[PDB]
Design a protein around this nucleic acid. Sequence first.
RNA 1: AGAACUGUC
RNA 2: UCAUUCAGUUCU
Length: 245
Amino acid sequence: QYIYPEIQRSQIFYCNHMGREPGVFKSSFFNYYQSKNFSCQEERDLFLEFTEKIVQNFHNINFNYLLKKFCKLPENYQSLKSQVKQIVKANQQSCENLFNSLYDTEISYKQITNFLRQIIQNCVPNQLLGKKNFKVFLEKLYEFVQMKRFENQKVLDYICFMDVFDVEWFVDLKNQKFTQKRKYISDKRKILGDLIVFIINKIVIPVLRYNFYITEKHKEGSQIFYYRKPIWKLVSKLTIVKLEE
RNA sequence: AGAACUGUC
RNA sequence: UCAUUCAGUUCU
Ligand SMILES: [Mg+2]
């Protein structure tokens, strides 16, 4: 047995921080790590070459446009921003209608997934996971978004639909590939899992966390909703004026 | 009031 | 650039 690294999906929830311009954090490797299951020292350099290849294309990604295209602020946002710019010893009902408009602005699972897929396809090279495996990875992203609170994914359900032979940059020490490949699959699946974790944990999740406030409603059960960071800043700021209530 | 830059869960 | 909270600086 091999226990794959955990996908941390609890990170996407309840992030209040707005960072001005989009494109994740300053703490992320994207702005200014772990090698284990790799064979020899050569694979580690090949992985490091993809990572620096990855961060460069990331800066070429325009998050302002990709958001606009996919996950879009409401057309009344300016009016919503204006109405919260008011109220700051009255305001009782009108705020209730103002909260109903802000929470109305949730972003659909398909929207979020199309956004994520667009980020990954631009950010992550197709040669990293291999052509067919990269396609399997992108398809599985909708389930990741759609899934409720406390619902998670396992790397086990990723790799099992993939092929380790689709990865061309994996290296073969002293040729075990065609001799015993039950072993080769066993060793390389450990690396492929680390790559899947890498994309999801260090890219997909921090993108979602940073740009969106993800939570669940009391009335909606464990089902989760994606709110735009600016929208939630309005909500958060409209809750603060309720300090009196 | 318009505009520009920078740090950042 | 649909947006740009918080903090800090600057040009009319
Ligand atoms: Mg200021």
